[PDB]
Ligand binder design. Structure first.
Ligand SMILES: CNc1ncnc2[nH]cnc12
Length: 209
């Protein structure tokens, strides 16, 4: 069964902005999503310090980038803490209502879209380059869920029946037709080296057939 939810008004407004503002420096989406994955990895690492059984669902802590030119998707996988159903519904574990307010005021006071991550809502930068985003996640305390939104004011949550993940989060970006440069291995490596050079977890860029 699929449950459909309305976004809180502030988040709908953040998304509509991101989608409809002119802003050429779109590559920052990948920095923000890698940063989110790094934070999720830090969280499960910290919990495992006093309860090593937290890593029974997977001891490897890493980030994988998977381009797929056939489906026009870029997938970011981490083996971090994952999200419960409650986390998903509550704006993917963010304080997005208050963060959106602070971000929109910073914009009028001379901030630009690339500072989105400082306000805790960097996930939504995915919509600079994606027509739809699918999030598959598994937390130790819950089942595997799929979240999906094409913007337009709603999101869906369902129990995921695909391949089990163990623990972590898979963010699947369905790229806009004119944003396929982010499927190119050269372009991805340029962005990672420019913006994510000092992330403290291995980042593997998968190759295509
Ligand atoms: C966006 N919120 C997230 N929460 C937990 N783990 C993640 N991995 C990537 N994004 C997240």
């Amino acid at each position: 069964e699929v449950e459909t939810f309305a976004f809180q008004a502030e988040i709908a407004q953040l998304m509509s902005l991101i989608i409809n503002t002119f802003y050429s420096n779109k590559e920052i989406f990948l920095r923000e999503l890698i940063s989110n994955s790094s934070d999720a990895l830090d969280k499960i690492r910290y919990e495992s310090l006093t309860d090593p059984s937290k890593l029974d669902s997977g001891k490897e802590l890493h980030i994988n980038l998977i381009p797929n030119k056939q489906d026009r998707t870029l997938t970011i996988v981490d083996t971090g803490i994952g999200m419960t159903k409650a986390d998903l519904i509550n704006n993917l574990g963010t304080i997005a209502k208050s963060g959106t307010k602070a971000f929109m005021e910073a914009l009028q006071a001379g901030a630009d879209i690339s500072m989105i991550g400082q306000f805790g809502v960097g996930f939504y930068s995915a919509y600079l380059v994606a027509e739809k985003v699918t999030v598959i996640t598994k937390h130790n305390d819950d089942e595997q869920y799929a979240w999906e939104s094409s913007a337009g004011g709603s999101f869906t949550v369902r129990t995921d029946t695909g391949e089990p993940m163990g623990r972590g989060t898979k963010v699947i970006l369905h790229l806009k037709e004119d944003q396929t440069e982010y499927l190119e291995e050269r372009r991805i490596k340029e962005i990672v080296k420019k913006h994510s050079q000092f992330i403290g977890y291995p980042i593997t860029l998968f190759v295509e057939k």
